[PDB]
């Protein structure tokens, strides 16, 4: 809904490369969207902190190899999550303007003489039916984790005692996750989020040359296009699986 507002505010354009500035033009959207990114990254005491980071610590809480592996694996998932969430908030709001000039022309400075009545379109904020959800959804994204964290997590809570969520006593980890995990791994995602966020802002704004060396290195040209192309999964399915079925159907029909 927040990113829905920014797409509408400009031209129904969707590309990050042509969005910039737009923090002043869209004051509510940036805050609410940053309300969301702080909980999406599970910044402490957000609605995501009480759910997302409990899985990480309950993963290490189950003292097995597979539990430790997925902790390490999901931890890397956390750090790349914080990374593209900086990419969204920096490019669209905190960046140098990248799109056309009509996105930006106000009425303060006078750029027109005989057409000053129209032809501004300075990326206006939406109306009541657009903003009332965003503000309500943001009020959830702040308080909802803390208010229901006992209904669902608790310590011996009996909300799901009708066998709706039956956990077998040979698997439970809540006590260990409450006590066994050390403070370092209990807190580690916060350090990584607070570390790579300032690093990402610095690379995206302060030192805006390193990334292009990476993109225009051949090693980085390939690593970039491997991920942008979604692990090449679509390419392989469409060519090896989907188009195999169409040619099988053709072979049966013709031959």
């Amino acid at each position: 809904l927040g990113a829905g507002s920014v797409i509408h505010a400009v031209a129904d354009n969707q590309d990050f490369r042509k969005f910039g500035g737009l923090i002043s033009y869209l004051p509510l959207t940036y805050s609410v969207m940053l309300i969301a990114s702080l909980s999406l990254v599970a910044f402490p005491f957000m609605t995501g902190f009480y759910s997302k980071d409990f899985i990480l610590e309950s993963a290490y809480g189950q003292f097995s190899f597979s539990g430790v592996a997925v902790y390490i694996i999901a931890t890397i998932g956390a750090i790349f999550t914080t990374l593209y969430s900086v990419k969204v908030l920096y490019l669209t709001f905190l960046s140098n303007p990248n799109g056309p000039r009509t996105y930006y022309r106000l009425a303060i400075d006078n750029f027109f003489s005989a057409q000053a009545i129209k032809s501004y379109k300075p990326a206006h904020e939406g109306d009541f039916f657009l903003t009332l959800p965003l503000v309500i959804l943001a009020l959830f994204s702040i308080f909802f984790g803390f208010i229901t964290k006992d209904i669902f997590i608790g310590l011996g809570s009996n909300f799901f005692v009708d066998n709706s969520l039956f956990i077998h006593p040979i698997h439970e980890i809540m006590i260990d996750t409450e006590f066994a995990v050390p403070v370092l791994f209990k807190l580690l995602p916060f350090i990584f989020t607070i570390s790579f966020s300032v690093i990402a802002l610095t690379l995206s704004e302060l030192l805006s040359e390193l990334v292009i060396y990476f993109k225009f290195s051949r090693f980085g040209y390939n690593i970039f296009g491997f991920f942008n192309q979604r692990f090449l999964i679509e390419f392989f399915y469409n060519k090896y699986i989907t188009n195999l079925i169409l040619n099988l159907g053709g072979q049966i029909t013709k031959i």
Binding site: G249, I252, T253
Partner: protein, 494 residues
């Protein structure tokens, strides 16, 4: 006289009236059409009267007339809970078949109406007769009027198409004749009550199976053998295509509950793996080539092959669930295939005069009502819940799996590939761009005739998909006498 003979005589009376009104008048063809349609309404009225008086848990044939005047070939008419719904489908379908093709015939209108009124008699008979030689007589009397229904009112490739169905259906039916003749010679009659008592030796049943299955594989039809259907179900007129797919295709579905399940059980059991292999292949090869079909009416015909395989695998499961799901999917295909021939061969071919899917695109923009019904019909063909087609597939597939788990898993691929052909055709014609540029002028949306036969057919599919017990209550007791087996603590009681 019996009330089951009234179903037969009414279309016969209607043929007489069409041929003797012009003698009481250069009479209009409109009055030819009204007589034939009224006289198919009456059969439907009577058939629902028969259904109110039916007894859902009686193991004796019902509505029988005591003949006690024996001859060599005597008509015996009984109704049973395994045959009642086939009769009802016939009598509901034949009025829509007439209304669907109301303005499209344009010539030889008397002959057209007289063939369909003749067809309704013969197809009603095949479900009502209590002999297996009587069954064969009517199962093959439908062949001459269908050769003429295609060559007089068929499309461009009508001549080859009419030869294909007649000759394939004649050949396949003559292997069933040899096996029926053997059963009669051994037992002395083909009256059902005396056959079901009799148990044939295993080797004889292994050779009666080879003969009843050659016929029904020719008449399902399975993949290797379906070249007549891809011609006949396409070149035929719209009304011909509705009867051929909804009713004629089911003559062998109902003919397995009479000819195989009760009198050749050991053969059916020991040879099921051969049936399932054939059925699995026609679920795949037919699904693969229904993707690459450029004729819209041919795409609908090919869909019937993949559907028929699922019900054929259900009738060979030895389970109460796959047997009822086979009847439900036979009924389900009846309403849904009817609607998609109405969309393909009766609306696009009325407006464009072509069946090539290359000329169609974005028909939602100018025919929103056609798009709505075309999508609902397309989702039932894809076996989507809330339609009677989904129930028939769920129960058919379950029994296929419980009997031989590997073929049911390859039969269940249908779930994926039926959805892929159905959505791809719908997306290409209704969606898929804008109104096509080969349409020089605009096309009107549905007429009140086209709306109400699609609406009628679609309504049957949904309400029966919500409350299938409308049809399941009659089936349970009668179906419970074609299952072969025993359980150790429930059998041989003292």
């Amino acid at each position: 006289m019996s009330l089951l003979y009234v179903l037969l005589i009414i279309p016969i009376i209607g043929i007489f009236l069409i041929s003797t009104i012009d003698s009481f008048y250069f009479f209009n063809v409109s009055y030819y059409k009204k007589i034939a349609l009224i006289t198919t309404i009456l059969n439907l009225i009577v058939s629902l009267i028969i259904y109110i008086l039916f007894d859902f848990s009686n193991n004796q044939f019902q509505f029988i007339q005591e003949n006690l005047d024996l001859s060599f070939y005597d008509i015996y008419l009984g109704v049973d809970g395994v045959s009642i719904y086939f009769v009802l489908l016939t009598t509901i379908i034949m009025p829509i078949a007439l209304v669907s093709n109301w303005n499209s015939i344009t010539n030889n209108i008397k002959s057209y109406l007289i063939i369909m009124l003749l067809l309704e008699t013969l197809l009603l008979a095949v479900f009502l007769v209590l002999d297996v030689l009587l069954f064969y007589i009517f199962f093959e009397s439908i062949l001459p009027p269908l050769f003429i229904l295609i060559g007089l009112f068929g499309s461009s490739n009508k001549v080859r198409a009419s030869f294909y169905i007649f000759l394939y259906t004649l050949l396949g039916s003559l292997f069933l004749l040899l096996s029926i003749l053997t059963m009669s010679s051994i037992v002395g009659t083909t009256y059902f009550d005396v056959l079901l008592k009799s148990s044939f030796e295993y080797t004889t049943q292994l050779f009666l199976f080879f003969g009843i299955f050659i016929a029904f594989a020719v008449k399902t039809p399975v993949w290797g053998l379906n070249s007549w259907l891809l011609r006949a179900h396409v070149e035929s007129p719209l009304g011909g295509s509705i009867v051929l797919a909804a009713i004629v295709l089911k003559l062998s579905l109902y003919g397995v509950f009479r000819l195989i399940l009760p009198i050749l059980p050991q053969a059916s059991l020991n040879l099921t793996y051969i049936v399932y292999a054939i059925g699995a292949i026609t679920v795949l090869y037919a699904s693969f080539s229904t993707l690459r079909t450029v004729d819209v009416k041919e795409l609908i015909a090919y869909s019937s092959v993949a559907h028929a395989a699922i019900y054929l695998m259900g009738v060979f499961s030895n389970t109460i669930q796959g047997l009822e799901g086979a009847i439900l999917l036979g009924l389900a295909h009846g309403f849904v295939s009817s609607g998609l021939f109405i969309c393909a061969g009766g609306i696009l071919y009325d407006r464009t005069g072509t069946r090539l899917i290359y000329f169609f695109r974005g028909l939602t923009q100018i025919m929103p009502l056609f798009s709505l019904f075309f999508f609902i019909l397309c989702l039932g063909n894809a076996g989507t819940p809330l339609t009677l087609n989904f129930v028939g597939e769920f129960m058919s597939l379950y029994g296929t799996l419980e009997r031989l788990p590997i073929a049911g898993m390859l039969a269940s691929t249908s779930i994926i590939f039926s959805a892929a052909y159905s959505i791809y055709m719908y997306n290409r014609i209704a969606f898929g761009g804008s109104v096509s540029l080969y349409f020089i002028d605009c096309f009107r949306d549905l007429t009140k005739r086209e709306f109400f036969i699609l609406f009628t057919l679609v309504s049957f599919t949904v309400i029966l998909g919500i409350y299938p017990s409308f049809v399941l209550d009659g089936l349970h007791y009668n179906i419970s006498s074609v299952v072969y087996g025993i359980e150790p603590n429930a059998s041989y009681l003292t």
